[PDB]
Design a protein around this ligand. Sequence first.
Ligand SMILES: [K+]
Ligand SMILES: [K+]
Ligand SMILES: [K+]
Ligand SMILES: [K+]
Lengths: 103, 93, 93, 103
Amino acid sequence: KNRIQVSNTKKPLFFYVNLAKRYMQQYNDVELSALGMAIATVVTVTEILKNNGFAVEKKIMTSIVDIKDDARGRPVQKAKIEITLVKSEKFDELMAAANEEKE
Amino acid sequence: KKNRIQVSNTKKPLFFYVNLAKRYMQQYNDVELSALGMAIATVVTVTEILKNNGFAVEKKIMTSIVDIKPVQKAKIEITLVKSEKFDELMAAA
Amino acid sequence: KKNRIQVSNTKKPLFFYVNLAKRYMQQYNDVELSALGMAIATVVTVTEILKNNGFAVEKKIMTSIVDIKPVQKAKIEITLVKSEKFDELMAAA
Amino acid sequence: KNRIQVSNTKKPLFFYVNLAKRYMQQYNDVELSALGMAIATVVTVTEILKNNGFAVEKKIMTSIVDIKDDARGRPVQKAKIEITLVKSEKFDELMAAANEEKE
Ligand SMILES: [K+]
Ligand SMILES: [K+]
Ligand SMILES: [K+]
Ligand SMILES: [K+]
């Protein structure tokens, strides 16, 4: 339920950042995974969330797994990253201070 | 449509697009390579690989902002053609 | 040179370039953003961030292949200008 | 001596792939590290080397460290990847079969 898999090149970067912010607020943590050319997105989302102050990372892992590839006959290999983030202590404030609602 | 490759598959290997572009040049002479957002890097890489290795030359390289079904995304369109050293590099590869 | 940002620093945060572009628009109205090879993705992202959030509009978006001191690299050049909603988004940000 | 740190945007992808092939032939293994927008390069180099058959990965790690940032006054955070590869059993053959030298 709190999993985001980046692949669709039609989506804007902020879709994922905001989708992660949601899942974090709703579920405390969030998972972010991506393959090959999509790892840049998850990398950038994490840098954004960490820097602006929303979250802290709990696990950051990149592996090389196999992928079913009917064209090549036998599976090819791709880099896959998996990043679990959890809400930071400043998250609630930020998800309000930007809206002038910070109590 | 037959000579246009759209890069939008994160599972694919870089070479699927480099080799597909080479197979297309063999057929149609030219080949179009396009992509949105995060996939532009791949098209960029493909082109650079083909330019540098001497397989081809570019004819058109255009980047524009398009509306997606509004959300805007960068889209690059690259048209390549076989270079004078193509057929030999292929017969030797 | 004062209104041109060249993205070529892997240590920098995405926002250093988004915010720098916003500070430049405040000064010169427009702002040029350029990059080679792997850095084109960042320029692509910067632009998309500014287009979507409503800060600005593009004027020029060109990608070309250039010789580096020959080795070829893709280079993108993007010129932006403040959008009619700029000053308000900045005074509110 | 067998370390490659990707940063320079003027370099072609094949510079790194071939530099890694060299360090591997010379030193058995090779290290490949990169920050943020440069992780895509190391990711692609590894996929290339693994797929074409040159190497096997021994360690693949992405972390979020601090970086000195005089402009922001206090360090920002960036993603950093580190990938150690070692020569595969097919490496020697490939670094010859392509040259019609495969004995
Ligand atoms: K309030
Ligand atoms: K096609
Ligand atoms: K400047
Ligand atoms: K021989």
